[PDB]
Amino acid sequence: PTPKYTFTERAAAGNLSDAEILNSNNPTGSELPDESDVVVGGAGIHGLIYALHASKYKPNNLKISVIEKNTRPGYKIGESTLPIFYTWCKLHGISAAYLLRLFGLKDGLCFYFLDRENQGQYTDFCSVGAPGLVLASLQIERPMSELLFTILAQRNGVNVYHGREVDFKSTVVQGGGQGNKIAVSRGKYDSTPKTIDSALFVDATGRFRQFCSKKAPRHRFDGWNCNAFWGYFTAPKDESKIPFDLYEGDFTNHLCFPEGWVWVIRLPSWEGSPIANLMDMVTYILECADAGVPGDELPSSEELARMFGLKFQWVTSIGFAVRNDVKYPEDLSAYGTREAEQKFNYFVQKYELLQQFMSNFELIENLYGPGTTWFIRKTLAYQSPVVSGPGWLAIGDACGFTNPLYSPGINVGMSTSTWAAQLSHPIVEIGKSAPADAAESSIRKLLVPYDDYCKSLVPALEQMNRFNYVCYRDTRLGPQVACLWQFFAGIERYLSDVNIETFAHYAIKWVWGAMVPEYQQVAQKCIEHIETVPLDERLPDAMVDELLAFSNRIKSAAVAADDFSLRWDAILRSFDRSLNFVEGKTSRDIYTRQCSGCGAWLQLRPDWKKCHSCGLLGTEPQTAVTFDPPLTAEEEALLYAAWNTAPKYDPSKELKLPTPTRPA
Template identity: 35%
Template sequence: MTAMTPAALSKRFPGLGSSLGSGELESLLDALELHDAAAGEALVAEGTSTDALFLVWEGQLDVMQRGRGGDRRLAQLGPGSYFGEVSLLDPGPAGASVVTEQGCVALRLSRPQLDKLRTSHPEVAASLLADVVQSLRAKLNAAAALVGGLPPAAEPVTPGADELSVGSRLARDFRDVSRRVREQEAPTVVAEAVAKEYDVVVIGAGPHALAYAIWLVQDRPETRVALVEKRRAPGFKIGESTLGPVVRAAMSMGVPLPVLRRLFNNKLGLHFWWMGEDSDELHMQVDHVVEETFQLERRVWETMMLRVARRAGIDVYQDTKVLIEESRTEGQPKELVCVSSGGDVLRLQAKIVCDASGPAAVIGRHLGIRRKYTEFNTNAYFAYFTKKADVDLPTWDVAATRHLCFPEGWVWFIELASWERASDENLTAMVDHLLDIGSPDESAYPTRFELAETFDCPLDQWPISIGVVPRTDVDSAADLPLEERFQHYVNRYPVFKQIMDTYELIEQPYEGLPSYISYLDLTQHSDRYAGDGWLLLGDAGFFVNPLYSPGMTYGHSMASFAARETVSALERGDFSEQAFAAYDAGARGMFSALVSECEMWYRSFRHVDAYERGLMLRVAFFIGLAHQRIAQLGGIHAMRRMVPIRPMGPPAEPILHPRYNELLRRLIDAMRAVETRNGDPEETARVVKAIIDPLIEEIAAAEGVAALRLGDAMQYYD
């Protein structure tokens, strides 16, 4: 996070910087209270009384208001923005909620703190109020335009005038205009429905929620399952790369492989390179090309899986929000109180509630068990581009998920087939048509381009998602404005700059989102993952990092395990905390293993040799652990045959093997020690090789491993 200095405050809020000196800015910082908000947190809740102003320092926030069509986003705020101007100037109920989806840092000033500042440093308070009033006036003008009215006449506000009086009048005007906006949107009828009974209710309708529900019905067809999703239809989400287990999982849920080939871009495995600040070349290419996988647009994936879920008899309530404070999640039966898009209240009763709501983590936050991971964390800065020229780098242009690793982190390159311009109705019709064909035979399906024309679904081939994911503790771009952070790393690494010179930015490719997007402190976890008849799944439980696609891969594994544990509980009629103890233990173990593996990789990126060993550790260990089974299946080439396979779940996942986790801890401890004593990157490489090289030699010498011909799975790495 950027250090909160007078210079940084001046840069974030130029209006303050132009009117206040360094000492005055220091006094203002002393009056402000730091608020470090977790992903999904509402800093302001609509209808609650508040008197505070917030200055956005880091992250993105959505201003949300309830309306006839459910919650709607009024605005998105980023660093350098104010919100809460009305509450500060005219304390009272908030007219909208302000929520951060991925976490943010803000500075808070309450009305009593403002009053103290006006007494102790009147010139500082006057300048702040002048800037706040200017911000509020711009918002008032925009709100007035929504109701076709004229904004109030502007009153000049300069330091020395009665800024508070002017601001209070503007605040009251803003409340009046906001009331008229709300009246235009108010629902005409609000009816309360009777309670509906289910065996299981799932909060959310993302990939893991859908997989859990579908497998649950496959395992126990009589199970009554409902999903509650706050969005009207699937929309943009990050998380676009898949590995083989996710493809096989989709096939096990009834999606034929040709359907995936029509909707998504194929990818040829994973390719990694290392880059340094002093070189315009790519170093040490490591690649894995084992199986057929895809690059996803999540909107399309979720549309497809929603159709599969509905066909399985699962009830889906879209555009419906869970009111968790009014719900009952303890005891039996559970009851979720939900409000639909039309304002109707739904009461869904169930024996088991699964929270798969993503970073919103509805139950986890309600119970106060959601946490930001403090030992190691990362940020992400990303955008979307089109390719305008080829780059003169051998082996770079390959249809794979490409990774550029560097001492502070890594960069992803993911080429998509984008259906973003297709309407929800047309996209759903196209997906239904593909599922209706339902054949494993390629020749039974029209081409992607024929589908685009038949169903009026515009297709954009090859937009590319590019994101930089640095460690938070060494993120040298953290003190820059959001739009400059990505470019900071481009300019810092010559070969990255050479590559990016062949791409052109797509401005705002997804509606409602800026061109550059930032997620801070990605790694989140929970104190518990299951309790008395409830469990947390996917990002609602934990998230680590996008490196090696663990969210989709292991989220599906956990969904498979959760479905089996849920069936067991239903069959026994036992919904106690103990009934889900195995799931809780599995989730704890999975998070611990994934976060350890992630930290090991990041610390190894300090040196090209350590980077190589860190990547090969996973391949060597996992292949060595399963080499006999791989041989029985027909070797590496047989793994390329994509067949339906449901994930094993945490008890059988190789990443949970005790020896692998012991190796991860040894590597992390050794590399942390080097960094703590300011050791150079060469020392990091030495300690990594000392631990990993003997293991690789041991695995290579094991009987049967050589016969697998692992080199056939790698095109360039020797």
């Protein structure tokens, strides 16, 4: 396809503002509709996932308007995504060759556990991704992911309105047929607000809980919560002076210690790019996905940035998520002038390994505009007691949140967001086909399982988070208990069978394994023990022994009872074919390589001979996957064959759950 510059030229021709050039790609035009079936408040990642999944599940059934107050896709924290998310993207027609032009390759999760009382000592835990011909995971700059999903939404019959705000003072939400009058202005100063008459409102305003806060006070869990402070840094081409052995920048890296952990995420950034230009680049990418352009004939990231006049650079997102019962020194002016900067640099110097680690990265000033060198956020975890009612329902962060650890935000949160999307078709149709009272009763009951799932989802994630945190207080419990149980309970079994029709059902059954009984049984024993040891103390050695033995005993039984075949020793670098810890084991599969030219990480697959990021051609042998233990010629062609295309819909198929087999 010849690249078009439709939006770049349209913007200059009319001197259009950022929100006007975006809203001009709407199927129903740039002004608001008089009526819609569903109005979505907030075009964050979940509002857009909701709208894309609702129209893809049942096209041409619901008119859907997404309202977003930002004039363009704004900055968001939350960049790490997981296989269920890539699978969703693929089911919506965008495979890795194209997504990698925009986002960073993620090849699993790595953890390092720093010993507090013995500075310099550490342990690790590594779990890999998948071969190039199986799937990928993504590190996403959020302004770009939400631009991609805006454009995809607009090409699938959804209108998205940036620079427009839901006014929750004058908006009316009701259960009476088509009872909703959604007031939409350009801001508080705006004399002429518009109304969108609608059947169903979707609160997707994130942690702000703009609508559902009207129905219940935000709810906080017992005990300590977490604080976060973070910033953006250069991404070194040469990751070899990093102080951790076998470090790779294409994992999501977790530096863990008694007070909490640090995330390290390598992702490309498109800041400094005109919005209209990005619209043309994205559009062209979708046209190449529609045409089926092979990866080696698709332009590289840097070549796209030349073509469309964009700005492109590699950065590292580094941040702390720590407990809020940490005692800080009273005066921290030696470490900075803002609190975020102060606490970040105070913690770094607390650990020689963190300081040695950070010494490979150069801070980036105000990557996302003025004041954005440092971010801080306090009291992360919360739950919305009420998530639905007559005329409305909430999704994503507006239902609850816990912690960045294991990325439940996007990847678990899309369970509520896709299920809501599916439930939206009968919700609107009930309202169009029965009188008001019966319609209301039928809808209320239809949503009972949705509210129940939401009510139980966040507390299970909270217990999962505390489980991991208390185990990060010791360099053996971290990898051999917490991490081990998270991947056994939470690895996504049978994900290659998911399609658009079963996605929501499969997603709500996952929950990162946080509902698996044996997982919760080990989690409760650790939390029950470790929480009694005060944070500023080291865990007694006998307590670690006891917890290690208890976990291992429960583990052997639940592992034997799992009928899902996995090359566990190839996936967990520290463990064998059962999930036994092995002291010296270093062997794993190798699915990636670093470009020698730009430092970007690449998937090893035969049909991709060039770097997708800078275009530099590598040697032919390099793109050979390493299977350790090995796979024959037929075992590998058998593996790649399952992950090619998702199966069609069979409404008489049983859904195979991602969680391990019950012991019976």
